[PDB]
Amino acid sequence: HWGYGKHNGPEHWHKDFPIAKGERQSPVDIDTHTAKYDPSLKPLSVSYDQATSLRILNNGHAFNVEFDDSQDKAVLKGGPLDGTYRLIQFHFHWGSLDGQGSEHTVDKKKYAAELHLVHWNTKYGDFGKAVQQPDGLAVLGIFLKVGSAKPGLQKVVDVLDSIKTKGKSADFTNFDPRGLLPESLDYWTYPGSLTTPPLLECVTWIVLKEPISVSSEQVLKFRKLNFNGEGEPEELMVDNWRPAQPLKNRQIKASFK
Ligand SMILES: Cc1cc(C)cc(NC(=O)Nc2ccc(S(N)(=O)=O)cc2)c1
Ligand SMILES: [Zn+2]
DSSP states (O other): OSSSTTTTTTTTGGGGGGGGGGGSOOOOEEEETTTOOTTTTOOOEEEEEOOOEEEEOOSSSSSEEEEOOSSSSEEEETOOOSOEEEEEEEEEEEHHHHHHHHOEEEEBOOOOOEEEEEEEGGSSSSHHHHHTTTEEEEEEEEEEEEEOHHHHHHHHHHHHGGGGGGGGGEOOOOOOOGGGOOSSEEEEEEEEOOOSSOOOOOOEEEEEEEEEOOHHHHHHHHHTOBOOOOTSSSOOOOOOOOOOOOOSOOOOESSSS
């Protein structure tokens, strides 16, 4: 079954998921000199005041903080998007080393980690329908660099002990995802895909220009998670990122100059 190792990793995925070699795969390298400023792009609208977090889950590939998406509580709108997208979960991808871990890269630069806030288009009724549509998801991607601590991340860090292994979950109510955002909402955008199997080509990617800074201790605690389940040999959950994929016939647009 797929993973991130030498025998089941990104180089293998195309055998079960042939869309891995498709025309709008993610992540990509963001070449900042080739991205074009689009003055018709609108500012992002991030409305997280009514967000309702529920649970945090180690799913064997990352950990997801899950939200109540049965109503318009935490939504993303504007930017390149038409319509309203509901926040369903966020998760991260990270490295074994501070110099690697992000999925997108910027002028080939790799960050220590990358946050994905996953949203689905309410015109499609449910997340399972949305992933079957070319405009079904909008994922807001935020780079993490190692430096000073991110205070709004610490409640996530402190619960990871309780979800060490695959299949463990814990209650995670009353978490405010606004504490994970950088100051600026300047962004790059392009059409892409999920970055893990089934690799569906259903995502409008919105990647913020400004990284957030997390401490070395915070990302160190990410790296103590386990890919394995309890009672299985320990496999540290590190390097759960897909490398950059060919841009093919796509243009990355910038909301800024
Ligand atoms: C509809 C459905 C049902 C189940 C049980 C799982 C999934 N998988 C899914 O949503 N995966 C997913 C993969 C990658 C991203 S990313 N890394 O591009 O933000 C988000 C969701 C999708
Ligand atoms: Zn992701």
